[PDB]
């Protein structure tokens, strides 16, 4: 009867539709990146889109994820420049969760993506 | 003829519609929070919504901004828990930009929002 607790670094299937232009849309996996307190009590979560239309990480705001270890359709890339705040009503099901090493890559990609690295 | 550049810390009027549930929607001012390299060359920007339904920070992911200095309709709040990636076609017009001190608060609130602080 109780909630399934949403933790940072979890991967959920989410309905991002509809979108415009180069925004990632459709029903796709997303990784929770909001802090755990916000995830426990807020009506919204902050996610980063995952796409399988590309294979390599190319740019430093992208993070690759294996298909086997994280049980996806194919080798995919976390897009830390494709972020959105979703009402929890958009969450369909929990797919898996990212390892500690993989979430450190997501952390570093967010620092770059949002210009948070103290430069000098 | 050229387009004025988009810089982190700028405040743009942007069309966020449509949305669902507790997500911020409509056509409202938003703060550019993506790095400037992305803002110059990427087809998308990353923004944080500004709301007028509160005028005082409810949590440490909220940052207040006075209407007079930043040309708002009323005293508003930047919601660093309401961030989204927008195609630049949604950007309507640049309203203003935040001071260095105010962007420091935005940086700190974003660090809490996305669980990026040390530990």
């Amino acid at each position, epitope marked *: 009867h109780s909630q399934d607790p949403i933790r940072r670094g979890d991967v959920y299937l989410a309905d991002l539709s509809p979108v415009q*232009g*180069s925004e990632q849309g459709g029903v796709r996996p997303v990784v929770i990146i909001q802090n755990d307190t916000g995830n426990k009590y807020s009506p919204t979560v902050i996610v980063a889109a995952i796409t399988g*239309r*590309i294979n390599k990480a*190319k740019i430093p705001t992208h993070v690759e994820i294996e298909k086997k270890k994280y049980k996806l359709d194919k080798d995919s890339v976390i897009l830390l420049e494709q972020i959105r705040t979703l009402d929890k009503k958009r969450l369909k099901e929990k797919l898996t969760y990212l390892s500690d090493d993989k979430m450190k890559e997501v952390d570093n990609a967010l620092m770059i993506s949002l210009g948070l690295n103290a430069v000098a | 003829h050229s*387009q004025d550049p988009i810089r982190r810390g700028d405040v743009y009027l942007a069309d966020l519609s449509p949305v669902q549930g507790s997500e911020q929607g409509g056509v409202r001012p938003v703060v550019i929070i993506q790095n400037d390299t992305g803002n110059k060359y990427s*087809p998308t920007v990353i923004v944080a919504a500004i709301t007028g339904r509160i005028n005082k920070a409810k949590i440490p992911t909220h940052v207040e901004i006075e209407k007079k200095k930043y040309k708002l309709d009323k005293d508003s709040v930047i919601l660093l828990e309401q961030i989204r990636t927008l195609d*630049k*076609k949604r*950007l309507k017009e640049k309203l203003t930009y935040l001071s260095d001190d105010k962007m420091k608060e935005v940086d700190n609130a974003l660090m809490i929002s996305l669980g990026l602080n040390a530990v």
Partner: nanobody
Amino acid sequence: QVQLQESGGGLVQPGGSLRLSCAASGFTFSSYAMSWVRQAPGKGLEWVSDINSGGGSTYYADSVKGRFTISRDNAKNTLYLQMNSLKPEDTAVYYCAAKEGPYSGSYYYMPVFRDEYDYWGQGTQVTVSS
């Protein structure tokens, strides 16, 4: 009502040049950033070049930068692509595409798709072979 018609494609030898054009009508051409994207046989869409709604800002893919030049004349409601130093890898159908907004127009690094743009032309064929 809305139409983007390309012209100016053709057959050239390697090292030749071409001037593509794309005429707009049915919508406010000056309110839209314009793109050129090309598609080779059996390949996905490759973004080529971008120009903002006013014409002052241009962007190019690394594969064409320096060889191609995008421009626009909002009085004629026409977009141009000047192609020089053509090579066989440039053989493709070339589409113009529009996206509204004064701040649109940028460098595309992902694979592009038709729904990522507002309006699409019918394409013009470019073939580079001796």
